[PDB]
Amino acid sequence: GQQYSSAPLRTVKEVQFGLFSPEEVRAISVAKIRFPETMDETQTRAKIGGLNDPRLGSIDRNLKCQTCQEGMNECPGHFGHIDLAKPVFHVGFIAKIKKVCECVCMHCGKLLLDEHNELMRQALAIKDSKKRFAAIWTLCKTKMVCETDVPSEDDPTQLVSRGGCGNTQPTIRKDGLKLVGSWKKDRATGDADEPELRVLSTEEILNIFKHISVKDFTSLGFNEVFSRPEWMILTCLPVPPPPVRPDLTFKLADILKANISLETLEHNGAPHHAIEEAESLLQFHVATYMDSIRARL
């Protein structure tokens, strides 16, 4: 790598953290990773356009990728992608995803408390975006309805309207990698006892997140450019080049086996419960994949 680069040379003065939206992941990919294999075209122990060389890396000695050439050595690695039959949670953020869920109305996607509340106008004021989320969540986890009308500051004979909707809110629980909602009508009087348990599909959460206002998710610590809530949910999944893998392939193999068979089912028409169970194996294999990549070192 003793070879020359006309690109001016500098030090790093700032690191800006965020999440990879699925657009940007498709965006900087080379390969679409679909078959889950190394080598043998039918039966040719040589190279496959599907995983392993489809334009990213190379063992081979060949000063070759996709006209970026250099040694099996001064090649960064390039980045792959694999479009995901269904959305799955990022295992790392289940608990975040769950707390956002608890702060937003789960039909419209609007924050459960706002400016009109006051205990929440002090939480909104907080400057540290971690202590702010903390504090607003503490005020909203409680809120079981998406109000329509609310007392205003002012002369409280009167009410005033907020972005409305009126829908009741689940009490959400963690059951591994599945989030579980439980709705009621009161806390046991007349009118309605016995909650209605129901799992929260990735699908709907992802859809509610996409409906949350920039104002509202900013207020929750997210950032319109670097980190939107919805990106905690994976849709498009980055495939590292061979520089990353020293047996993590054996596991992304198994992701695609599952991605392949969730799609061949959705294709065939196939019962509700089979589609869901294949969805859950997708998830577990995507989650296993990263909770394994906690190999940093």
Partner 1 sequence: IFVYQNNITPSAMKLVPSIPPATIETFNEAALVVNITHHELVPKHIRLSSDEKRELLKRYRLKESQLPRIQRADPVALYLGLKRGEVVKIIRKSETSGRYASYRICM
Partner 2 sequence: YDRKVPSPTGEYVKEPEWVLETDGVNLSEVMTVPGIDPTRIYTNSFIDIMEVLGIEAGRAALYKEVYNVIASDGSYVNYRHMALLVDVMTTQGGLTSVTTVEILFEAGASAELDDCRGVSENVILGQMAPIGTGAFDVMIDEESL
Partner 3 sequence: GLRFGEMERDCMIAHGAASFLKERLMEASDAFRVHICGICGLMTVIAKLNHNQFECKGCDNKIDIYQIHIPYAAKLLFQELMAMNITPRLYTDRSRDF
Residues binding partner 1 (CB under 8 A): 125, 127, 153-156
Euclidean distance between CA atoms 113 and 232, whole angstroms: 23
Neighbours of 223 (CB within 10 A): 15
* Element holding 162 (H helix, E strand): none
Residue 146 sits in the site that holds Zn ion (CB under 5 A): yes
Q: What is the separation of C-alpha 40 from the centre of its chain, rounded to a whole number of angstroms? A: 34
Residue 19 sits in the site that holds partner 2 (CB under 8 A): yes
Beta carbon nearer to partner 2, 147 or 230: 230
CA atoms within 13 A on the CB side of 135: 18
- Tell me the sheet residues that pair with 223: 227
Is 75 flagged in the annotation as binding?
Answer: yes
Least CB distance to Zn ion at residue 166 (A): 7
CA atoms within 13 A on the CB side of 29: 22
Least CB distance to partner 1 at residue 122 (A): 10
Query: Contacts with Zn ion in 47-106 (CB under 5 A)?
Result: 65, 68, 75, 105
Q: Tokens 């206002």 correspond to what residue?
A: 213
Least CB distance to partner 1 at residue 145 (A): 21
* Element holding 72 (H helix, E strand): none
Least CB distance to partner 2 at residue 36 (A): 26
Residue 5 sits in the site that holds partner 2 (CB under 8 A): no
Q: What tokens were used for 239?
A: 């495939």
Least CB distance to partner 3 at residue 276 (A): 24
Q: What is the separation of C-alpha 101 from the centre of its chain, rounded to a whole number of angstroms? A: 13
CA torsion through residues 204, 222, 101, 118, sign: negative
Q: Tokens 């992802």 correspond to what residue?
A: 206
223 binds, among partner 3, partner 2, Zn ion, none (CB under 5 to 8 A by kind): partner 2
Give the residue, chosen from 7, 13, 246, 273, that forms a contact with partner 2 under the rule CB under 8 A.
Answer: 13
| Interface ranges with partner 2 (CB under 8 A) | 11-19, 92-93, 96, 129-130, 221-223, 225-227, 232, 294, 296
Query: Which positions lie near Zn ion, rule CB under 5 A?
Result: 65, 68, 75, 105, 108, 146, 165
Question: Known binding site for Zn(2+): residues?
Answer: 65, 68, 75, 78, 105, 108, 146, 165
